[PDB]
Design a protein. Structure first.
Lengths: 517, 512, 517
């Protein structure tokens, strides 16, 4: 009765590239086939445009202000329930292959098994410090060297990572298929979390070649000069060391080309996973979700990467396909915060069991024609912020607030590229009432003073602790997968014939000319 | 310049047994000689009368309301600085041998090396539930079978543990001595944390025999009937399943006898540590601390173990000896909360570096004759509480508050056994104004409604997660001491003569 | 400098299926391409028709009587030099992905790194016992259930293993390519050792479908009844529990069809390795060997699997390709015993440094047109033998001796299918004199009484020890691969940009130190 759940997650995928499933110009036949049978959430947003905050929030269905994972080095408490816990409590086998950027000594956070280590660190090294506004840390900050460095390679740090993530996810699916004839097996939930299309913007030749004739290599909004940028965008450019890189038109085109090429790299791995589900005969009983942690400005407005609430950074794709999911396109804004309650709903878990632990809403009713009215909230409190920023997405509007900056208000229906800041330049009385309305809702959801103080305390505490932990012998927190070789394959407490039968799936099949095995 | 630091910690040691170092009737020659040499804090209290809360608070110098380690299964966040971090940041090698009842995947919390696993669990299993007031969990709650089951054995779970804690601590001291002649060495801080004299009250014959003629086998206050007990004591007796145990006078004597015997068992281990320091020539450069996480009523008032603020449960000894420490007896109340700022002060760390992270005060000024006026605060929010309790200890007074119970106010100078509740029976207008003053102080320090809400959220959260974590394959968080065999002793990337010389200490010695 | 060496090994591959590279009827485009550019040894033999003895002898270039690895449970001493030692001593990084059926607590035998555990046991469980002739051990002996159970499945024990073997082999090549521009790098030798096409004869549907119209699904020589079999064949059929299986023609076809399908399964993995070598720019400096431990009778004569000296069981392919290797087909008999001295010769190691440690001869002279006259020797002393057997292969002749059985003498020129035993039915005085000459050679090479005594002592010794080791807590010897997660990918003792550059290969436009092609 309970469906299997395959979560396919990718990193830094601009949601505007999924207008209705993948954009037509992308070479993504597998993701395009998946989308045609999916509920597709067009205006879907991350909870925070940064990896560890987005992913802790994604796992728990809680905003960063609640998980306390403010930045890429903030400890994620083991006691915070995640969709892994909820599903595991409900009888699921739960596994992760790939990245989740969990910081702290808990590298599972409810997952029963984790098949790879993380690509990124698990310690407090990347802790920002609001006491030194304007500083940058060159050994890990984003810099525009990813833009000037884009190109072609046959292996990279990330391609090693994702190649392994995919192999072990498919291996696990093959292993799980051996139970497929047991009606009393546990349903499974496998999260497969790739690091592409995150930079470096570097792609295998095969996929780079797919985009030789690409007509989407120019961003839709050109570079805004530093002196004309809004303050947060200015902070982002300084954090990227913009003044020490000469980003040419060609650099922009090459970066976008490798990025699209790495989507096609991912599409092939999506196809592998679907193929494994199909041939092992678990496709029809498996829900498939496609999601990402945050987007990438990809040169739009002159900006790259994330760390802001503009569409290209804050929007991320979201699709759900499988049993009991009617395909279609949904335009109401939604959030990564809705994924954990949606997963619980699809798993048969009652609303009361998840209500105290989740800040979002289930999307299943929406899949079934029921309007969703809840606004979308977002937060940011890491590098290139000197104080926290919050945003609200509701109806056609986006509102952004930072105690240090002028407000931003965008009418995304009329101004999808967010070129006109209606808080600075209100069109009339309705714009003014709308700003008051969003100010009141902002004040209702966030105490920005308490938010700042909480972030400063978290940073300061971690810097004392991390300074200590980097003296003397280092104790690493990186997850080490363990697959006991002494229990695998054939060992001499076993019966070879029984082993071979148990590891074969499907079983008892095979006919040359006499079609009964 | 920076001294070495040896912290010796024991578990469940009633502080009333250290009036001026160990009480006369205890066979504790090694701890008595240490005490003559130490600043001794007579009226020292734990921050919380329970293992994990007291220990998380002890390491951080923060109360449970700040660490959020409310009970024996509450997660201790890795990001909370401890004295291990403070000393490590300042250039110390830091190590732990033995118990600290850290809950969560971090089993070091700043310690650079940990030589043993913990005796107790590292996961959320022992999480209380304020939604079910009155329940008890038989498979891990205290029960008076410790009292009826006291006796003599040559090995126990705890004796295996402590024998190993002791061996590895002395081994580590020996290993450290090999750097003692190196001017570029780091100073070291070794915490040696024993589980005795925590129950089961079971002792080796050798130490049991020391107390054949002991005159302290009867508690000073007898069993108070359930009807006549204060509400919290009633909760504790119910949690101990008291209705199903017939505790006789013999049981009480046998339990106390084994407890004293296990203090003597520890005293021999204290002697071993000091002997190693002496023969390795590290004694004179080493501060030595003696401390405990909480006490044990030991049958006084009819109660056993801890979980309350009465003297026998809330008082724990505290002594400090070594370079720059004037010996003496101090009567002003102190707290385990003061240990971390004291350690930092002794180690040369500035007050500013530790002020944002510690709720207590350094005891070094007191050691040097400066009056200390800060009150001592305590908290409890675990088994046998249905709502959090707080306590204030200041001057001659102890005040205890729980939203569910009548207040308690004791004048410990006039009523050292806390037999007269002056909140209930004021002696006069000074007692009345004193109660009002402590009420005002409590309200200024604690939002008790927020406290209860925070504890309930922590409990609920953990029960969701722990139920999940006990489905399928279990991933344990217990500490596994580091594996290092390929780098130990003689291996063929090394020169044998160089090895022998480096591992020999003292060096160049001998006299025929 | 010295060349890289990729050793592609497969298990239980009947050498008659590679008459000149792969037979025409096989779907094996990658191995046929490889064969076209290789020196191909048509009449190449295993040293012992069984996995562990063949593989210990292969690694050492020593016969079983010298390695003392007589059977699948015999300890292989760590002190015995292997091609891994020889190459590693000469400056090579050496690695193994996959199977080598090493028995004993040493699971590396000179390999610097092993990327997978073994599919098979590493302890003394499978020790035969000459004190009980006629017994069989049902929980691990071969049985004709492989033939009756042949068919189609998408995962098996062996495809899980070989999928993993392949993935990690290709990953290791990618990792090694990152050193390819460093002139201080070590040359590398990677052995990729697959368990297919060993039974179970079970194949993925994709590859099974390739052999729908196959014309080779029935053996040329059909089943010989027990009462007309030679004694050793009779012992093999009894060991296979042949009396309890009804092997139909359809069963024979299904088994051969799956077997061929698994050759095609392996051919796709060969193409994968070649593709990785090509795109990493490592192909042109890489010697590629293709080899197998023993063959598979595949129903010929009514026999299945190995354990004998007939062509289908004793012949295994051998090809060598790469720098300095002239392609060609060689008909002089060779042996797996020659691989280790050939590898050393090709790696630039002098003959004097390997001569005291190998029984075989380098094939490099033969590749360069020098005649080879050394005979090919083989030994067997495991299951289905009640006493050791030896064989001599020289010129057109094969001679087989066992103290318990009539001699066999075959003229492979006139009788390629070994249907006429010329020791029993000589054609004339030349056949008679040839038998005497092989008798004298046999007596000069082997003391068969001593051989039997040595195998009996080895068996008895292991059974005493194994009986003890299976009491109480078991201590496994299985190899546990370890890739330390605390040193992989991004960790906060590193600079992220330095990391990315080091892990990117090839290093072209956009990389730190590429200024031109
Ligand atoms: C991804 N970086 C590590 C480059 C910066 C944090 O987003
Ligand atoms: C586990 N016990 C409850 C028995 C002791 C800790 O309080
Ligand atoms: C391969 N078996 C394990 C089936 C028997 C030994 O060759
Ligand atoms: Ca990310
Ligand atoms: Ca305790
Ligand atoms: Ca084999």
């Amino acid at each position: 009765g309970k469906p299997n759940i395959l979560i396919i997650m990718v990193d830094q995928l601009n949601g505007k590239l999924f207008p209705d499933g993948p954009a037509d110009f992308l070479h993504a036949p597998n993701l395009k086939a998946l989308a045609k049978r999916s509920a597709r959430f067009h205006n879907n947003y991350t909870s925070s445009p940064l990896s560890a905050p987005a992913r802790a929030s994604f796992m728990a269905g809680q905003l960063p202000s609640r998980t306390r994972v403010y930045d890429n080095a903030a400890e994620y408490q083991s006691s915070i329930p995640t969709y892994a816990h909820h599903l595991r409590r409900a009888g699921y086998y739960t596994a992760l292959s790939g990245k989740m950027h969990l910081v702290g000594p808990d590298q599972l956070h409810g997952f029963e098994e984790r098949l790879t280590t993380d690509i990124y660190p698990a310690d407090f090294g990347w802790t920002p410090d609001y006491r030194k506004p304007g500083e940058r840390i060159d050994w890990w900050y984003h810099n525009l060297g990813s833009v000037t460095g884009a190109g072609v390679a046959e292996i990279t740090n990330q391609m090693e990572y994702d190649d392994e993530v995919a192999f072990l996810a498919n291996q696990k699916l093959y292993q799980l298929s051996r139970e497929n004839d047991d009606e009393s097996r546990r349903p499974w939930c496998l999260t497969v979390s790739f690091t592409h299309p995150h930079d470096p913007y570097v792609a295998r030749r095969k996929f780079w070649d797919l985009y030789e004739d690409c007509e989407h290599l120019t961003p839709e909004v050109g570079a805004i000069p530093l002196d004309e940028q809004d303050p947060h965008s200015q902070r982002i450019m300084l954090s990227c060391d913009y003044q020490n890189f000469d980003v040419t038109e060609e650099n922009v085109r090459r970066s976008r080309r490798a990025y699209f090429a790495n989507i096609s790299y991912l599409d092939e791995k999506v196809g592998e996973l679907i193929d494994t589900l199909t041939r092992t005969r678990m496709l029809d009983d498996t829900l498939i979700l496609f999601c990402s942690d945050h987007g990438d400005m990809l040169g739009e407005r002159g900006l790259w990467f994330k760390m802001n609430f503009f569409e290209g950074s804050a929007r991320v794709p979201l699709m759900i396909a499988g049993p009991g999911i009617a395909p279609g396109l949904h335009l109401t804004p939604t959030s990564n915060l809705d994924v954990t309650p949606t997963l619980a709903d699809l798993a048969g878990i009652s609303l009361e069991e998840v209500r105290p632990w989740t800040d979002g809403v289930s999307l299943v009713p929406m899949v079934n024609g029921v309007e969703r009215t809840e606004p979308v909230l977002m937060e940011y409190a890491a590098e290139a912020s000197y104080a926290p920023l919050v945003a609200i997405r509701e109806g056609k509007w986006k509102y952004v607030y930072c105690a240090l900056d002028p407000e931003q208000l965008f009418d995304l229906e009329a101004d999808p590229l967010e070129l006109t800041n209606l808080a600075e330049n209100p069109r009339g009385p309705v714009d003014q009432a709308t700003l008051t309305a969003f100010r009141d809702m902002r004040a209702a959801h966030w105490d920005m003073e308490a938010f700042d103080a909480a972030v400063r305390e978290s940073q300061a505490r971690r810097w004392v602790v991390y300074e200590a932990l980097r003296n003397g012998a280092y104790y690493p927190w990186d997850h080490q997968p363990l697959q006991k070789a002494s229990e695998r394959y054939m060992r001499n407490h076993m019966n070879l014939d029984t082993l071979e039968e148990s590891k074969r799936y499907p079983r008892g099949e095979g006919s040359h000319h006499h079609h009964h095995h």
